[PDB]
Design a protein around this ligand. Structure first.
Ligand code: NA
Ligand code: NA
Lengths: 246, 247
């Protein structure tokens, strides 16, 4: 989504760190969202690691991922991070953001089915061109913070074009904080440090269930140095703590 | 389960707190369980609050609970705990162990259906005598720690006689700790202090998903003073920490 309203009270959390970015926070639904930056809220960026959310759903829907207990075996050959050099469950691969596991899922899904599902999901600009195993890493796919919270709301409500079972499976894999009072589902992304005069993007997207309320959120920021990466969680966390949500 | 073995390594965690209790810990991959006390692992106790797990599944299966987004509204009449005096989701009602919500679920399920599902689930002695809204807390229902882990393994595998959807809904409601390397699902129970002569029971049951391994656990202890209640989590947590599973 409905209106997007600007909230100036969050800018201090960005300025304190010299961060150029956006937070979008929607209470109850995407009908009413708040943001620090109206223009950037709808600006589209490479999804990077946040693409594992639709990719997992599509993997399950197509049967490429058999069910939530499938183990993705490591073939013993070098992977870019040591934490990826092991057998992984679906939740495990999401939580350590094991790119090679999801590259193989994408290859098996294939371009025709991938395009079909991103159209169904209204996922960003739906541009998968240039390489089926890297379009979300270095390709032309782009999605905004507002679109992320619309997509996550659909997932929360089990309203994506997928079985409820498969949406529930992916939601369980995204739980990142549990307390009696609230539950956080979320996913990070980081495209890289970019190139000269062209920074990369870092993301944190998800939702919070607190009492009988739900809050959808999406954060992104420009980033050209990996030492800044934790700000993708700390800035939105500080905003949501000051709102009383977590 | 495939096998069970008694292990003395864990007794020190009980003796340090002067607790009479049992821990059962089962590793899925090896189909192997260990316990500090084989006799007590087979003893059957009131499930108390741990019964919210089957009760939630049954409520969903029967349609008494619509789905995971149903809100259980507070009517404004005082409840035994201020923390229950509010609208609650299914997860919320499970996490604060809101007795009156699940009493009403049980009433709507009814005796005939409740009996049928506890038979399907092989849940304890399947005796629901004592009142449809109290049999798990003050009635004749009894379940052992071994039976709890058998039941929880079936839930984890979506092998209970319920839709996978409803098993998944209840599993999400049971998540109590999330870390990048492991996920804990769990539920507490407490029957009361009983007497000095005949103490109550306190429970902590659940499972841990770590790497590709899954550990099913059930803890219970005698309890005659509510000040000891935190031990139902701290003793099994210290044991699972010393095995390298959590923390
Ligand atoms: Na790799
Ligand atoms: Na981070």
């Amino acid at each position: 989504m409905g209106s997007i309203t600007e909230n100036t009270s969050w800018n201090k959390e960005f300025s304190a760190e010299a961060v150029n970015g956006v937070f979008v926070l929607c209470k109850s639904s995407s009908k009413s969202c708040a943001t620090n930056d109206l223009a950037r809220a709808s600006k589209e960026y490479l999804p990077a690691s946040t693409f594992k959310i639709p990719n997992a759903i599509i993997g399950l829907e197509t049967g490429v991922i058999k069910n939530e207990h499938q183990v993705f075996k490591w073939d013993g050959k070098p992977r870019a991070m040591k934490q990826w050099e092991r057998d992984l469950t679906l939740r495990g691969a999401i939580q350590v953001s094991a790119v090679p596991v999801f590259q193989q899922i994408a290859r098996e899904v294939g371009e025709v089915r991938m395009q079909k599902y991103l159209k169904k999901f209204s996922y960003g600009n739906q541009n998968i061109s240039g390489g089926i195993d890297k379009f979300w890493l270095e390709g032309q796919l782009r999605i905004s913070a507002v679109n992320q919270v619309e997509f996550l709301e659909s997932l929360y409500l089990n309203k994506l074009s997928a079985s409820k079972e498969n949406q529930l499976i992916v939601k369980e894999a995204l739980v990142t904080e549990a307390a009696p009072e609230y539950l956080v589902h979320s996913k990070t992304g980081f495209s890289g440090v970019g190139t000269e005069s062209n920074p990369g993007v870092a993301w944190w997207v998800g939702w919070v269930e607190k009492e009988t309320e739900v809050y959808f959120f999406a954060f992104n920021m420009d980033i050209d140095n990996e030492s800044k990466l934790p700000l993708r969680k700390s800035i939105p966390t500080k905003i949501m703590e000051s709102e009383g949500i977590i």
